[PDB]
Amino acid sequence: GSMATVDPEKTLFLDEPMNKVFDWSNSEAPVRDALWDYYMEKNSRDTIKTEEEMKPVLDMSDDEVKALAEKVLKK
Template sequence: MAEDVEKTLVLDEPMNVVFDWSDSEIPVRDALWDYYMEHNAKDTVKTEETMKPVLDMSDDEVKALAEKLLK
């Protein structure tokens, strides 16, 4: 049985489409990755571990997280 791979579409939407306060065209996923990379001293392994739970979040949870961290 095939698993639904695209659980969270908000992660793949451009920031400026999801949020009216952003003019960035990068996907929400990349914006969060960049944020965590900066806060993890550019440690890719730490950032990957930090991002893993985000992949299982609902669209509303991802929006709230991005709003909290990136606004």
């Protein structure tokens, strides 16, 4: 029979912990939550504008999410 792992992790890149995928971050929050906080702080904690700016992030490829994170989060 198969020795393959049962139900292997299939986590989306946006749902991985910041400090798992980015060696420059110490946060344990999912990438998408770190990006959300960046936009919230930019928008004085207006969730409506924040949701508009986050929408395109969900259509980004993983390489684009890394590029965005390094632009706005890596400080």
